[PDB]
Ligand SMILES: [Zn+2]
Ligand SMILES: [Zn+2]
């Protein structure tokens with residue numbers, strides 16, 4: 001079949017941040033008509049989720065992430081760097097998500113958006129979109 | 135190679151519900167002999183996991199989801215709709231899971247079943263099974 | 269295209285354990301030059317994450333998993349077997365992760381390693397690496 005590999009960067013504006021990257025991903029899949037887009041970050045302290053980018057919810061993801069794994073929590077990693085919480089929550093959520101491609105477009109539900117969740121910003125994060133199909 | 139795309143629906147019976155959808159997924163992969171099945175929901179308030187569908191555990195997934203992200207919790211999203219908890223826990227778990235296909239069948243471990251977890255039911259949920267391989 | 273399917277085993281040394289399996293996965297993808305590696309376990313009580321294998325963090329993943337879903341917690345599943353916590357946390361994290369392959373090598377970020385997280389050891393765990401691409 002066919003394999004497309006394209007990367008783009010986004011600048012996170014705070015320690016905790018959430019960015020809707022759907023538009024950038026739709027550009028990155030060009031070349032594939034029907035298949036699968038793997039939205040991947042080669043980072044260990046930020047994650048990718050597919051959900052609703054409503055204003056309040058964009059805050060909720062971060063605030064609940066903080067509730068589940070408090071940045072002020074106890075982390076053996078923090079002996080070296082103070083972002084153990086970012087590593088832990090990011091590992092649980094995952095560093096990738098799949099989005100089907102159909103008719104050359106992202107096949108998303110009514111309320112689905114591709115979102116990058118940052119837990120150790122501000123930073124320039126790189127997103128790799130590796131698509132496969134025909 | 136080959137790309138199969140098939141959808142099926144399941145009716146959730148409660149706000150919190152868990153449904154073993156393995157049989158429906160085994161039908162949806164027909165056409166692919168060796169490859170990968172991406173079990174995807176284009177929903178933002180329900181998720182997909184691959185685990186054991188034992189009776190008690192089917193309750194545990196829901197009860198622990200509730201413990202981690204209480205529906206009665208504080209959500210800025212709830213200003214618009216009262217399902218912020220469903221959005222949050224679903225984003226963390228993920229809206230898809232991969233299952234390998236071999237010999238035309240789902241390659242599952244002894245205790246593995248494909249399970250749909252509902253956090254904002256009752257609703258008719260749609261599952262997309264996008265398979266790729268030969 | 270091409271489909272490679274290779275399995276390897278790792279012995280977990282404790283109830284809770286974390287093992288860097290990156291090297292074994294790099295061997296298992298041989299045959300694929302450009303594509304996607306799906307690192308999968310057909311188990312229901314251990315999970316796969318892609319993150320930093322720093323010494324302290326390797327402990328943090330396990331300790332925070334324990335904090336989120338206490339093994340001593342209430343599980344209806346424990347009427348049959350006392351590993352309900354392992355099932356729950358493993359379902360949330362997921363039983364697979366994707367790693368892109370480029371130039372015949374795992375395309376990993378500076379701090380990324382493929383890690384197996386065990387919550388019901390000691391056991392011999394099997395990892396399936398199903399790769400697709402050219
Ligand atoms: Zn760190
Ligand atoms: Zn909502």
Ligand SMILES: [Zn+2]
Pocket residue numbers: 345349351352355
């Ligand atoms: Zn069990």
